Amino acid sequence: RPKLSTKDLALIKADLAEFEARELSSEKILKDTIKEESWSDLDFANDNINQMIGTMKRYQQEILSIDAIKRASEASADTEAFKKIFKEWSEFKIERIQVTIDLLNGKKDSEAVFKKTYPNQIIFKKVRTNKLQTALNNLKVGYELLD
């Protein structure tokens, strides 16, 4: 009978926090690079952003690969629904950083894909994050999303 153990809840909560912190660092590097600060040329941006994408992807996969996350469809309603929404939330947040660094390298393929895949980016952001909060809440993980 697959259930989210206490350890699993702890790992989720720890991982979310680290994942949002990486989101926050990408943001600073991205702003400094758009603004063209002297320390922040495009090699600097690419080296650091690439690191943060991979770190972000690890947290995402650590979470996605908790046994009751993998077998979410045979677990409580609240658990399944957490899986689905954190997958869409985490994906968008990562791809959005990928696109922005792409753009700063004058690549446009991923923005085109991005707009096609997220037709309504603001409603999509507001919405996936609102339902992530509520799914967390329901799973009794006292984590307040930075947004």
UniProtKB/Swiss-Prot annotation:
Name the domain of life: Bacteria
What triggers or suppresses the expression of this protein?
Induced in infected host cells. Expression is regulated by PrfA and sigma-B factor (SigB).
What GO cellular component is one of the record's annotations? host cell nucleus
User: What GO biological process term is on the record, naming one?
Assistant: symbiont-mediated suppression of host ISG15-protein conjugation
**Mutant lacking the gene: phenotype:** Deletion of lntA leads to a decrease in bacterial colonization of spleens and livers, as well as blood bacteraemia.
Q: What keywords are assigned to this protein?
A: Host nucleus, Secreted, Signal, Virulence
**Bilayer-spanning residue ranges:** none
Q: Where in the cell is it found?
A: Secreted; Host nucleus
Question: Could you tell me which cysteines form disulfide bridges?
Answer: none
Q: How does it assemble?
A: Interacts specifically with host BAHD1.
Physiological role: Relieves the repression of host cell immune response genes (interferon-stimulated genes) by blocking the recruitment of host BAHD1 to these genes. May modulate interferon-mediated immune response to control bacterial colonization of the host.
What is the designated name of this protein? Answer: Listeria nuclear targeted protein A
What organism is this sequence from?
Answer: Listeria monocytogenes serovar 1/2a (strain ATCC BAA-679 / EGD-e)
